Amino acid sequence: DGIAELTGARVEDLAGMDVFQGCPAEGLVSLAASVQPLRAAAGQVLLRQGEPAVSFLLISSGSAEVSHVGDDGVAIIARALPGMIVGEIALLRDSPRSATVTTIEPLTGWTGGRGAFATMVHIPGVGERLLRTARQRLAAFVSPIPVRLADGTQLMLRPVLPGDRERTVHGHIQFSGETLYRRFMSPALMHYLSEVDYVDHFVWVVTDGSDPVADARFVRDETDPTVAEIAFTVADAYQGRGIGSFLIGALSVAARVDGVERFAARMLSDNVPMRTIMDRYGAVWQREDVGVITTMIDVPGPGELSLGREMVDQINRVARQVIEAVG
Ligand SMILES: CC(=O)SCCNC(=O)CCNC(=O)[C@H](O)C(C)(C)COP(=O)(O)OP(=O)(O)OC[C@H]1O[C@@H](n2cnc3c(N)ncnc32)[C@H](O)[C@@H]1OP(=O)(O)O
Ligand SMILES: [Mg+2]
Numbered sequence: 001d002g003i004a005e006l007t008g009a010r011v012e013d014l015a016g017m018d019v020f021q022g023c024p025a026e027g028l029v030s031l032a033a034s035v036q037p038l039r040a041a042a043g044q045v046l047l048r049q050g051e052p053a054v055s056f057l058l059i060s061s062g063s064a065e066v067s068h069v070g071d072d073g074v075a076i077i078a079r080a081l082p083g084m085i086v087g088e089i090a091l092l093r094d095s096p097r098s099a100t101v102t103t104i105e106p107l108t109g110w111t112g113g114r115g116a117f118a119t120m121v122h123i124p125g126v127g128e129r130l131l132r133t134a135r136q137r138l139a140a141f142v143s144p145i146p147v148r149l150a151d152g153t154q155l156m157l158r159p160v161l162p163g164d165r166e167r168t169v170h171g172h173i174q175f176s177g178e179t180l181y182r183r184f185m186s187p188a189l190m191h192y193l194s195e196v197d198y199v200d201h202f203v204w205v206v207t208d209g210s211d212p213v214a215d216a217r218f219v220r221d222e223t224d225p226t227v228a229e230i231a232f233t234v235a236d237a238y239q240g241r242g243i244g245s246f247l248i249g250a251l252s253v254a255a256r257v258d259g260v261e262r263f264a265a266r267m268l269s270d271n272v273p274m275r276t277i278m279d280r281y282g283a284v285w286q287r288e289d290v291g292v293i294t295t296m297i298d299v300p301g302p303g304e305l306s307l308g309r310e311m312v313d314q315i316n317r318v319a320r321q322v323i324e325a326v327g
Pocket of ligand 1: 172230231232233234235238239240241242243244245246265266267268271272273274276277280
């Protein structure tokens with residue numbers, strides 16, 4: 001009859017989504033209180049590149065184009081699908097929206113702020129599922145680059161994907177999810193952000209027959225954003241084939257996209273292959289205690305790397321895809 005009703009999200013609608021099915025009821029009651037219903041026609045702009053990222057979208061039905069336009073006018077375009085989160089990385093990093101999001105067909109879902117996202121990823125089972133969805137979001141448009149070493153070895157170069165162990169297994173640089181991302185804030189949230197972040201921690205992985213044989217990464221300095229520390233690891237049997245030499249090149253291409261101007265490196269003074277790699281870039285060595293040496297080099301500009309132009313363009317394409325387009 002004349003009874004009062006809720007105006008917000010309904011648990012019944014949220015619970016219909018596969019990601020929440022079976023979750024504790026109280027978790028959904030809290031979430032329902034935190035998000036708002038969204039219904040969009042086709043061809044409608046939901047989010048605009050460069051704007052404040054005040055919300056994320058969770059898509060219940062329909063799909064959208066996600067288009068990042070570079071200052072060079074080059075458009076880098078992904079697709080957001082039902083069950084997918086959109087806009088959440090810029091939301092969590094409090095940075096301008098990375099891409100314009102336009103529906104390709106009628107769309108429905110929910111919107112929410114940073115607190116709603118936190119509430120959502122705290123629900124048991126949900127954070128892990130959403131990370132799998134974030135993985136799928138990347139893997140849908142980012143493909144590995146086949147490369148061949150001078151000895152003929154056939155490998156693939158790809159960014160780490162969300163959930164991959166190479167994200168969290170690094171022994172060379174002192175840093176973690178909580179230390180790197182604390183400035184932006186909750187374990188579940190920090191984990192999620194660390195797994196989906198290509199801006200402050202960028203990791204390349206090299207595989208042989210789908211098995212990782214090497215990785216390299218840079219970690220952005222908290223005090224000077226134009227500087228990152230670098231690290232490399234190549235499986236023993238694969239060493240001395242030029243992979244490390246290749247990776248510092250790949251890492252430089254990604255750093256340029258990420259606005260990293262300079263790399264810091266530390267190692268033992270006797271690590272000959274690693275010193276040699278840095279020597280090629282004009283390293284000036286400073287001595288520290290306990291057999292350690294350090295250096296700082298400029299990230300080589302375009303044309304400066306010994307990699308072919310075609311190789312550089314392929315790596316640049318992927319780096320832009322993972323940094324710029326997809327969150
Ligand atoms: C900043 C840091 O990350 S420090 C930590 C580095 N990681 C480690 O020490 C873990 C174990 N070692 C590794 O993972 C790898 O060997 C790395 C990352 C050090 C080097 O990567 P690799 O793929 O083995 O090296 P790569 O084959 O590119 O060779 C690098 C250079 O060292 C040279 N080199 C390798 N071995 C020798 C040698 N025995 N004598 C002289 N020069 C050598 C290579 O010729 C090459 O020089 P170049 O520019 O003339 O071509
Ligand atoms: Mg092989």
